Amino acid sequence: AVQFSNASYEAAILENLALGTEIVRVQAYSIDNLNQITYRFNAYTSTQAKALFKIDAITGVITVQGLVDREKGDFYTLTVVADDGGPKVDSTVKVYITVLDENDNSPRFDFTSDSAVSIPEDCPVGQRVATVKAWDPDAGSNGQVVFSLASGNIAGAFEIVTTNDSIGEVFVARPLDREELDHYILQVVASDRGTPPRKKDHILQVTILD
Ligand SMILES: [Ca+2]
Ligand SMILES: [Ca+2]
Ligand SMILES: [Ca+2]
Ligand SMILES: [Ca+2]
Ligand SMILES: [Cl-]
Ligand SMILES: [K+]
Q: Coiled-coil stretches, from where to where?
């Protein structure tokens, strides 16, 4: 009765790996079987999994043949048949593939993010003055967004609070004075928490009214 070298196979692979990267090699054998084995995926293997992975008929080597994107799917199950090509019932084995995250996305600002606002000079300290929104689809820290006011925030006039790793709330932090300064060009930076962080800028202009 044909057996595999392992009861099941597993691999954790990085997303975005090159076409042709080897994932695992399946190997089956039996002393009382002199047919060359043909390795193949059976119909319990999903179309999605078959598109990303292939198995060599002779070697049992499983390679990447599509674009592996953790953002589209992070786990696949293959069922491999050790097909002897003859009337004996053929053994099968499971292959479990886990896709690990790369920091392959920067924060992207939502088009509803505020670009230009006007506020009067008596806008009180604590008043919410603008809102920005950014999205980062990566996992864990790689997909958590933090906002900052990297330039143009003269005298610490404004502050930005981050909520839900996505929304940036701009508040008045100190009293404003139109004669002192009537216009701000704030460089709002959305950064993820990857190592190193990936960053994107958004310009928010604030006019001070009379
Ligand atoms: Ca990806
Ligand atoms: Ca057979
Ligand atoms: Ca990211
Ligand atoms: Ca990713
Ligand atoms: Cl191997
Ligand atoms: K090998």
A: none
Going by C-beta distance under 8 Å and a sequence separation of 6 or more, which residues neighbour residue 72? Answer: none
**Same-domain status, 118 and 191:** yes
* Rounded distance between C-alpha atoms, residue 124 and residue 146, angstroms: 25
CA of 102 from ligand 6 middle (Å) equals: 25
Residues of the domain holding 193? 103-210
* C-beta of residue 138 within 8 angstroms of C-beta of residue 192: yes
**Nearest ligand atom owner, CA of 17:** 1
Span from the CA of 44 to the centroid of ligand 4 (angstroms): 27
Number of structural domains, the chain?
Answer: 2
Experiment type: X-ray
Torsion of CA 193, 199, 200, 205, to 10 degrees: 80
| Ligand 4 centroid from CA 184, angstroms | 35
Tokens of 17: 């790996």
- Pair (110, 210) in one structural domain: yes
Q: Domain boundary at 102, 127, 155, which? A: 102
